[PDB]
Amino acid sequence: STGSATTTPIDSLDDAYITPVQIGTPAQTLNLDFDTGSSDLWVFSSETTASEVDGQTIYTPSKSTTAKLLSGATWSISYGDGSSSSGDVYTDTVSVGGLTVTGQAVESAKKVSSSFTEDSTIDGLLGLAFSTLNTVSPTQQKTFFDNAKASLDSPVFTADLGYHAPGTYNFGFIDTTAYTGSITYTAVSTKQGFWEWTSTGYAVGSGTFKSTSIDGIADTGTTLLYLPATVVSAYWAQVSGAKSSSSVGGYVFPCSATLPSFTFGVGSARIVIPGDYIDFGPISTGSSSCFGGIQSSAGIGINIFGDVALKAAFVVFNGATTPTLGFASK
C-alpha cells in the first residue's frame, strides 16, 4: 500500500502546514500538523474543555462506530514553544491520503494550552518521530507510520513542503518526479527518538563552504532553522542592518534588506535555502523590522532543521531496520 496527501501552509508565512486526515467511521476529517519531531497523534475533540476550543474541527468518538476507549490510558505532552495538551485515548481507523491504519491510537484532548486554542487552523498533531517518544501511559502507543510500515510497499515516507504553496506527504514510495538530481542519504541516530542526523557544514550566500559537523533533527513541526550561535552570527553578519533583539527574541532585519541564501551540507551534497525563505515578515503589523528565519539554537539544547530548511528539499524519512534520511534538491 501507499498513501499521498497534500499539505497546505496555514498562513502566508508558512508558520506550519496542515494535512487532512480521516478519523473514524463514518470519516471525520481533521486538519493535522504532521510533526516529524514528536510521536503523538492528538486531536481537538468533543472532550476538550469548551472554553479552549475556538474554530477548530473536533473529533467526536461517540459518533464513530469503530472508536474504542483505550481503557486507563492518558497522555500529556509539552512542546519546545511551551505549548501543551493532554487527555485520554481511543483507538480508531485513521486514513491519510488513501492509506488506512486500523487500531490507531487517537489521543483525545481534554486540555490544550492557549497557543493551540488561538490557532483555529490546526485541529491536532500527527507525530512522525520514533514511537519511543510517545507519551501515552501506561502503554506507549505507536505512530501512524509505525503502524502502517509493514503494509507499505517500502517502509518510508517523504516530505515535500512548499514555499508559500502546497506540498505533499507520501507514504510507502518515492516519487522520482518530485526532485532533481539524486537523493543523498545520511545516517540517523534514534537515541533521542528523533530523526537526528549530522550535517557536513554550511555556506552563506556565495561564500565558501565551511566543513563542520552540525548535529540536528529533521523537524517538520518546527517553523524555523535553529543552528549554533556561531553559524547564525555568520549568516546575519551578511545582512545590512540585522541585529539580535532580546526584546523580540531573535535576529531581526530591515525589511528593505536582501537576504543571502543559506546552504547546508548533506554528505558531499548541498541543499540551498533561497534568501526569501528566511523572511518571516514584520515583527508586528506595520513594522519595518522583519523576523529572521534562521535563529540560534543556544539553550534549546539541540539544532533543529525545521520547515525553513526542509522546504528547500525533497526529504526521505527511511524507516528501514536501520533508519536513514535522504535529501534531494527540487
Short mmCIF file of C-alpha atoms in Angstrom, two decimals, residues 81-301:
data_model
loop_
_atom_site.label_atom_id
_atom_site.label_comp_id
_atom_site.label_asym_id
_atom_site.label_seq_id
_atom_site.Cartn_x
_atom_site.Cartn_y
_atom_site.Cartn_z
CA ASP A 81 7.50 26.54 22.29
CA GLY A 82 6.00 25.99 25.73
CA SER A 83 2.63 24.80 24.49
CA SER A 84 0.99 21.62 25.74
CA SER A 85 -2.05 19.36 25.71
CA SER A 86 -3.34 16.25 27.48
CA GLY A 87 -6.27 13.86 27.70
CA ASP A 88 -7.38 10.26 27.19
CA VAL A 89 -7.13 7.80 24.30
CA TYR A 90 -9.26 5.93 21.78
CA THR A 91 -8.29 3.52 19.08
CA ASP A 92 -9.91 4.14 15.71
CA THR A 93 -9.44 3.88 11.99
CA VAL A 94 -7.17 6.60 10.58
CA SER A 95 -6.59 7.27 6.88
CA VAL A 96 -4.10 9.60 5.24
CA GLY A 97 -4.33 10.13 1.54
CA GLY A 98 -5.81 6.70 0.82
CA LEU A 99 -3.62 4.78 3.34
CA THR A 100 -5.63 3.25 6.19
CA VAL A 101 -4.49 2.11 9.65
CA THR A 102 -6.95 0.28 11.88
CA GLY A 103 -6.48 0.43 15.64
CA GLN A 104 -4.54 3.71 15.61
CA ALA A 105 -4.16 5.43 18.97
CA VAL A 106 -6.09 8.69 18.64
CA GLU A 107 -5.32 10.85 21.65
CA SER A 108 -8.29 12.97 22.62
CA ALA A 109 -7.54 16.38 24.14
CA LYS A 110 -9.29 17.25 27.38
CA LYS A 111 -6.94 20.24 27.80
CA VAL A 112 -4.93 22.34 25.33
CA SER A 113 -2.80 25.41 26.07
CA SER A 114 -3.59 28.88 24.78
CA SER A 115 -1.47 28.81 21.66
CA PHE A 116 -3.44 25.81 20.36
CA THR A 117 -6.82 27.43 21.16
CA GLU A 118 -5.69 30.60 19.43
CA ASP A 119 -4.84 28.82 16.19
CA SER A 120 -8.13 27.95 14.50
CA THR A 121 -6.44 26.23 11.52
CA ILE A 122 -4.79 23.32 13.38
CA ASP A 123 -7.14 20.57 14.64
CA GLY A 124 -4.33 18.48 16.14
CA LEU A 125 -0.93 16.89 15.55
CA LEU A 126 0.12 13.66 13.84
CA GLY A 127 3.53 12.65 15.13
CA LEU A 128 6.09 11.01 12.83
CA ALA A 129 9.16 10.79 15.08
CA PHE A 130 10.03 7.46 16.69
CA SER A 131 7.42 5.77 18.82
CA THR A 132 9.75 5.79 21.82
CA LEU A 133 8.73 9.46 22.35
CA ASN A 134 5.03 8.65 22.51
CA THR A 135 3.56 9.95 25.77
CA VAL A 136 0.62 7.53 26.28
CA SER A 137 0.67 5.87 29.71
CA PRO A 138 0.72 3.10 30.94
CA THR A 139 1.10 1.52 27.48
CA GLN A 140 3.11 3.60 24.98
CA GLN A 141 1.46 3.71 21.57
CA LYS A 142 2.80 3.57 18.00
CA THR A 143 2.78 6.37 15.45
CA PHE A 144 0.69 6.23 12.31
CA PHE A 145 3.85 5.43 10.28
CA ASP A 146 4.96 2.72 12.68
CA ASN A 147 1.57 1.02 12.42
CA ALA A 148 1.47 1.37 8.62
CA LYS A 149 5.09 0.40 8.00
CA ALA A 150 4.83 -3.33 7.36
CA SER A 151 1.92 -2.85 4.89
CA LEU A 152 3.71 -0.15 2.91
CA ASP A 153 5.34 -1.03 -0.43
CA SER A 154 8.52 0.44 1.03
CA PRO A 155 8.99 1.39 4.73
CA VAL A 156 9.38 5.13 4.04
CA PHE A 157 7.58 8.43 3.96
CA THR A 158 8.57 11.63 2.25
CA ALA A 159 8.09 15.32 2.96
CA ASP A 160 7.88 17.78 0.11
CA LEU A 161 6.97 21.09 1.76
CA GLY A 162 6.17 24.06 -0.43
CA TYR A 163 7.40 27.65 -0.19
CA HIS A 164 4.27 29.78 0.14
CA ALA A 165 2.48 26.90 -1.59
CA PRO A 166 1.05 23.44 -1.03
CA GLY A 167 3.24 20.38 -0.88
CA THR A 168 2.99 16.65 -0.39
CA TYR A 169 3.45 13.89 2.16
CA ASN A 170 3.82 10.44 0.62
CA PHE A 171 3.81 7.10 2.39
CA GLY A 172 5.32 3.92 1.06
CA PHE A 173 7.03 5.16 -2.10
CA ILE A 174 9.45 7.70 -3.51
CA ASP A 175 8.06 9.95 -6.27
CA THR A 176 11.00 10.21 -8.60
CA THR A 177 9.33 13.12 -10.45
CA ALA A 178 9.32 15.31 -7.31
CA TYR A 179 13.04 16.12 -7.14
CA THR A 180 16.04 16.97 -9.31
CA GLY A 181 19.38 15.16 -9.28
CA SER A 182 19.94 12.36 -6.79
CA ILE A 183 18.87 11.70 -3.22
CA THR A 184 21.79 11.75 -0.79
CA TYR A 185 21.23 9.53 2.23
CA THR A 186 22.78 10.20 5.61
CA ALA A 187 22.96 8.31 8.94
CA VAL A 188 20.31 8.73 11.61
CA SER A 189 20.58 8.32 15.35
CA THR A 190 17.39 7.24 17.07
CA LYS A 191 18.84 7.54 20.60
CA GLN A 192 16.77 10.64 21.45
CA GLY A 193 13.72 9.46 19.50
CA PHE A 194 14.20 11.99 16.71
CA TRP A 195 15.20 11.87 13.07
CA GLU A 196 18.63 13.01 14.19
CA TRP A 197 21.50 13.40 11.71
CA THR A 198 24.75 15.31 11.14
CA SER A 199 25.06 17.98 8.50
CA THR A 200 28.52 18.34 6.97
CA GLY A 201 28.66 22.16 7.08
CA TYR A 202 27.29 25.37 5.63
CA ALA A 203 27.81 28.34 3.38
CA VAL A 204 26.34 31.85 3.45
CA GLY A 205 25.25 33.19 0.09
CA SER A 206 28.06 32.88 -2.46
CA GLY A 207 30.58 32.32 0.34
CA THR A 208 32.93 29.36 0.63
CA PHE A 209 31.64 26.23 2.26
CA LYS A 210 32.65 25.65 5.88
CA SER A 211 33.13 21.97 6.64
CA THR A 212 31.89 21.37 10.17
CA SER A 213 29.66 18.75 11.80
CA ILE A 214 26.24 20.03 12.83
CA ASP A 215 24.11 17.51 14.71
CA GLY A 216 20.40 18.26 14.46
CA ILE A 217 16.88 16.98 13.87
CA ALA A 218 14.65 16.97 10.80
CA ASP A 219 11.53 18.50 12.31
CA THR A 220 8.51 19.34 10.16
CA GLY A 221 6.73 20.64 13.28
CA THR A 222 9.19 23.48 13.85
CA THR A 223 8.86 26.58 11.68
CA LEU A 224 12.41 27.90 11.60
CA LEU A 225 16.03 26.80 11.24
CA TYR A 226 17.85 26.71 14.59
CA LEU A 227 21.61 26.38 14.39
CA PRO A 228 24.63 27.11 16.65
CA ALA A 229 25.16 30.74 17.58
CA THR A 230 28.44 30.89 15.60
CA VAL A 231 26.69 29.83 12.39
CA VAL A 232 23.73 32.12 12.88
CA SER A 233 26.03 35.09 13.59
CA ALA A 234 27.99 34.41 10.42
CA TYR A 235 24.73 34.42 8.47
CA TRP A 236 23.23 37.63 9.80
CA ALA A 237 26.56 39.48 9.60
CA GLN A 238 25.93 39.42 5.83
CA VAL A 239 22.61 41.25 6.16
CA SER A 240 22.84 45.05 6.34
CA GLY A 241 21.12 46.32 9.49
CA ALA A 242 20.49 42.92 11.03
CA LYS A 243 20.75 42.55 14.79
CA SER A 244 19.80 40.16 17.58
CA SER A 245 16.97 41.67 19.59
CA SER A 246 16.45 40.48 23.14
CA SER A 247 13.04 42.17 23.29
CA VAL A 248 11.85 40.39 20.15
CA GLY A 249 13.66 37.13 20.94
CA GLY A 250 15.99 36.69 18.00
CA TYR A 251 17.54 38.17 14.90
CA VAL A 252 15.57 40.85 13.05
CA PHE A 253 16.47 42.77 9.91
CA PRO A 254 15.22 45.70 7.88
CA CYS A 255 12.54 44.62 5.56
CA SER A 256 14.44 46.59 2.83
CA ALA A 257 17.50 44.30 3.02
CA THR A 258 18.27 41.50 0.59
CA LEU A 259 18.75 38.12 2.26
CA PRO A 260 21.54 35.78 1.15
CA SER A 261 20.84 32.14 0.62
CA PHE A 262 21.98 29.57 3.18
CA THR A 263 23.49 26.26 2.10
CA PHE A 264 23.67 23.18 4.32
CA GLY A 265 25.64 20.03 3.67
CA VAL A 266 24.27 16.53 3.36
CA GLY A 267 27.33 14.37 2.99
CA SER A 268 29.06 15.71 -0.10
CA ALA A 269 25.77 17.15 -1.40
CA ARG A 270 24.43 20.65 -0.83
CA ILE A 271 20.89 21.95 -0.17
CA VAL A 272 20.40 25.65 -0.93
CA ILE A 273 17.80 27.61 1.04
CA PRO A 274 16.91 30.69 -1.05
CA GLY A 275 17.14 34.01 0.80
CA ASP A 276 13.40 34.67 0.52
CA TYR A 277 12.68 31.53 2.59
CA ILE A 278 14.41 33.19 5.57
CA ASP A 279 11.99 36.20 5.64
CA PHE A 280 9.16 35.87 8.19
CA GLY A 281 7.81 39.36 7.82
CA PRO A 282 7.21 42.27 10.14
CA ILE A 283 7.58 41.59 13.85
CA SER A 284 4.27 43.43 14.34
CA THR A 285 1.78 44.80 11.79
CA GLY A 286 3.19 47.87 10.08
CA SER A 287 6.70 47.44 11.47
CA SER A 288 9.70 47.94 9.22
CA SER A 289 11.57 45.32 11.32
CA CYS A 290 11.33 41.78 9.93
CA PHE A 291 11.87 38.49 11.77
CA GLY A 292 14.62 36.14 10.64
CA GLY A 293 14.05 32.50 9.72
CA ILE A 294 17.48 31.39 10.93
CA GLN A 295 17.88 31.65 14.69
CA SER A 296 20.22 30.43 17.43
CA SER A 297 19.65 27.01 18.98
CA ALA A 298 21.61 28.04 22.09
CA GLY A 299 19.60 26.97 25.09
CA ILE A 300 17.28 24.70 23.09
CA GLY A 301 19.94 22.08 23.57
#
